[PDB]
Amino acid sequence: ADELQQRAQGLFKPVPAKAPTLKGNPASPVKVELGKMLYFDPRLSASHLISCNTCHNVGLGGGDLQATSTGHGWQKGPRNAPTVLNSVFNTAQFWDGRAKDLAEQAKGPVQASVEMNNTPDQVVKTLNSIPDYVALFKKAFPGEKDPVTFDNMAKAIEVFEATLITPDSPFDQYLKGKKKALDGKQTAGLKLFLDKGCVACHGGLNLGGTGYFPFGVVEKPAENILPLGDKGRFAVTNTAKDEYVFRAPSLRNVAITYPYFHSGVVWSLKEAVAVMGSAQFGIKLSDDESEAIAAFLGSLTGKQPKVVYPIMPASTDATPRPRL
Amino acid sequence: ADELQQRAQGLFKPVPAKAPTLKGNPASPVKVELGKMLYFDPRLSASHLISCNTCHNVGLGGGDLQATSTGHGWQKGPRNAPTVLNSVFNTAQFWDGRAKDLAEQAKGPVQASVEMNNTPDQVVKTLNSIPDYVALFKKAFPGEKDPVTFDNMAKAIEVFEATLITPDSPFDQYLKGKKKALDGKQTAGLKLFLDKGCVACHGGLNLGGTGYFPFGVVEKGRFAVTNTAKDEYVFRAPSLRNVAITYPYFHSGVVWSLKEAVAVMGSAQFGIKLSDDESEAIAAFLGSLTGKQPKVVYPIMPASTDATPRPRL
Ligand code: HEM
Ligand code: HEM
Numbered sequence A: 001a002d003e004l005q006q007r008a009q010g011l012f013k014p015v016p017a018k019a020p021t022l023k024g025n026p027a028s029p030v031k032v033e034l035g036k037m038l039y040f041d042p043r044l045s046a047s048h049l050i051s052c053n054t055c056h057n058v059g060l061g062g063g064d065l066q067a068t069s070t071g072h073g074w075q076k077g078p079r080n081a082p083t084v085l086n087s088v089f090n091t092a093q094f095w096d097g098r099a100k101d102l103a104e105q106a107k108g109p110v111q112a113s114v115e116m117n118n119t120p121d122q123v124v125k126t127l128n129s130i131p132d133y134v135a136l137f138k139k140a141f142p143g144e145k146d147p148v149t150f151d152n153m154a155k156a157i158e159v160f161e162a163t164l165i166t167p168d169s170p171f172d173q174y175l176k177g178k179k180k181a182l183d184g185k186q187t188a189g190l191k192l193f194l195d196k197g198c199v200a201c202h203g204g205l206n207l208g209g210t211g212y213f214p215f216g217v218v219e220k221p222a223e224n225i226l227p228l229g230d231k232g233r234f235a236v237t238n239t240a241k242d243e244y245v246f247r248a249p250s251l252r253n254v255a256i257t258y259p260y261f262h263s264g265v266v267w268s269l270k271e272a273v274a275v276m277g278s279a280q281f282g283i284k285l286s287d288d289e290s291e292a293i294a295a296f297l298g299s300l301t302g303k304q305p306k307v308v309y310p311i312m313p314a315s316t317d318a319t320p321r322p323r324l
Numbered sequence B: 001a002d003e004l005q006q007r008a009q010g011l012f013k014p015v016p017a018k019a020p021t022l023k024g025n026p027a028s029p030v031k032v033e034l035g036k037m038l039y040f041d042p043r044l045s046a047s048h049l050i051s052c053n054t055c056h057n058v059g060l061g062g063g064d065l066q067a068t069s070t071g072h073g074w075q076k077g078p079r080n081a082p083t084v085l086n087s088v089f090n091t092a093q094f095w096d097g098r099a100k101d102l103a104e105q106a107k108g109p110v111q112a113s114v115e116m117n118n119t120p121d122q123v124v125k126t127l128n129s130i131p132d133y134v135a136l137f138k139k140a141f142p143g144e145k146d147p148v149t150f151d152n153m154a155k156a157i158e159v160f161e162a163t164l165i166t167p168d169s170p171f172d173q174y175l176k177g178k179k180k181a182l183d184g185k186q187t188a189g190l191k192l193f194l195d196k197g198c199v200a201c202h203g204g205l206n207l208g209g210t211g212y213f214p215f216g217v218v219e220k221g222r223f224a225v226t227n228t229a230k231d232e233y234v235f236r237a238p239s240l241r242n243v244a245i246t247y248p249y250f251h252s253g254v255v256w257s258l259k260e261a262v263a264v265m266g267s268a269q270f271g272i273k274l275s276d277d278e279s280e281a282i283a284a285f286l287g288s289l290t291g292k293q294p295k296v297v298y299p300i301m302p303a304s305t306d307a308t309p310r311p312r313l
């Protein structure tokens, strides 16, 4: 009644009003500035075509609008790019894998991408060949006799990503005290999200982002007889038999990071809900129910970051050229 | 020193302090905001992978750092992406072709690109499927019942491009009065650029971008100017504003060093000979043509809907 406001408040938290602190990697204006430049600089790739913004697009929800894509070395094959927004809050860094692999695997999205699209010696040569980047790395990494390294390049970038957060969605304003930040169908959909137990895998600060479960969405085999992207076509499979797992993704800003699941197979938010009303979980959902949940998930879209586009410095005669 | 300064004030003009008016397509905040969203919006392309910023990248001197790409349907083969910066002040719209051919070639950078990577039916359908874009087109183009048109999409983008201009280069501050805006080597470069006659093809407000000439840079100190008048074939003499930041050079992106492009240009075909030092002086001068990069806020672009077409596979 507002047991509901108080329950939601227990199970969830709003996005804070400050970039969180990164262990080993302190924030500063200069570092945020460097990290912004590199995030958009396609010179990190060997071709000089691909930046992190290519797939992780700040004006499109932090994603890329594609079913799948291949950006990071650890990827099992093509996978739907998750959003960069609020990524700083997640702890499940990987879409999917054997549960034993996933526990000892090294973290580092920047290093996995660039060692895929280039080699670090060629990236560091790029950065050292440009007097402005060198100056920036000195201000951002004050103690180091040589601050221009592949791992510092990843640290700058990550201090930038940690500014890419989306506070003050309608739902966080509801968490913060204001019942009327949610409308009545949003409020009803919150109620089902909770009672139907979505909150179990999709809960917390980020509404997911934090656990692996032995369940994946699959395209069911026989028939050509239903619209492309209809729920009829997709189901949850149980993957415990093979000690295999998937992350239960953060649901923040889900309404703007379509298409959905690890394979990008469902375009409709109502439908991605209907698929999740799965028996594998003991969850049953009526049309009406899946529609109110998706309404509640609409309330998850926060303030999108105002990102002034970095003016990146000119290559010099010493700068590697696009790889043939 | 006073003679040089007046001579330059004579032959060139600074970038204006503000977006020039485009006949039949007036600026407004909303039209500018709309044209920005669409210039960054990869849903103009059928694959939803390419936007204008992809190759005319606003933080990278308005080009794409590649030798060649294919963005417009008039291109017969891959060509170096010219900067979008100060593009508004140019009149020579195409890189190269038979002079007769180009005379009849339909213009419109926006139309020719979106027609290559998609069709107008599919783009219009995409814009019509997002309430937020329909709402914006009606505010920007109130004089029309259905303002969501291929022609108006191009207009919005162009009024945005008209803002992507680069005032206050060291050269421009020299033209407005301050002699010391230019250093000693830069000043010596200017005298040479004038005296050797670069300014014939690269003069006025944008230092080129206005004429076609029967000279092209081809494989021959590897590359050289070639006379193409016998084929009735022409190339644009590109605007040199921001040339230092828009490598590689020429139509085919064959030359990466700005000192080497100046040396290729010091060609017998025009009657110019340049020494090693002379090319270096002038290169220093071209260095003073880089202006203030525009401060652009990344647009926040509106989500597709169930009616929006999917990526073309
Ligand atoms: C160095 C630039 C990049 C950065 C900073 C970056 C950032 C990230 C981050 C932070 C994650 C994890 C999200 C989370 O943990 O919640 C991730 C995963 C992913 N990113 Fe990127 N990315 C970059 C380049 C790219 C590119 C260029 C592409 C596309 C061609 C791409 C596609 C992907 C995909 C498909 C995943 C999911 C991989 C998987 O777990 O299967 N990334 N990226
Ligand atoms: C009815 C309640 C639920 C709703 C509305 C819901 C919602 C969603 C949505 C919208 C997605 C796709 C997100 C994206 O692609 O960014 C998703 C994926 C997923 N969720 Fe749920 N969820 C519910 C219950 C659960 C439960 C109970 C579990 C775990 C036991 C779970 C685990 C997962 C997993 C593993 C994925 C990724 C599957 C894949 O990508 O192949 N969800 N969920």
Ligand code: HEM
Residues within 6 Å of the ligand: B039, B044, B050, B051, B052, B053, B054, B055, B056, B068, B069, B070, B071, B072, B075, B078, B079, B080, B081, B082, B083, B084, B087, B090, B092, B093, B094, B095, B096, B109, B110, B113, B114, B157, B209
């Ligand atoms: C609709 C988005 C785009 C806009 C507004 C745009 C803008 C322009 C403009 C204004 C010009 C001529 C500049 C002048 O005449 O001074 C130009 C030429 C050119 N652009 Fe684009 N561009 C767009 C998309 C792209 C894309 C996606 C690519 C690359 C894949 C591209 C590559 C090129 C190339 C190669 C030329 C030289 C064409 C030639 O004359 O041979 N453009 N562009």
Ligand code: HEM
Residues within 6 Å of the ligand: B193, B196, B197, B198, B199, B200, B201, B202, B213, B215, B216, B217, B218, B235, B236, B237, B238, B239, B240, B243, B246, B248, B249, B250, B251, B252, B261, B262, B265, B266, B270, B272, B282
């Ligand atoms: C020493 C005097 C000159 C200098 C410093 C010079 C400088 C330049 C530069 C730096 C470029 C490359 C611009 C770019 O890629 O964005 C260029 C190209 C070009 N310039 Fe000049 N220029 C000079 C003389 C001339 C003259 C006298 C003409 C015409 C009669 C001319 C016409 C052209 C043409 C047609 C191109 C494009 C050719 C191609 O891309 O293949 N230039 N020039």
Ligand SMILES: [Ca+2]
Residues within 6 Å of the ligand: A063, A080, A081, A082, A257, A258, A259, A260, A261
């Ligand atoms: Ca997605």
Ligand SMILES: [Ca+2]
Residues within 6 Å of the ligand: B063, B080, B081, B082, B246, B247, B248, B249, B250
């Ligand atoms: Ca160029």
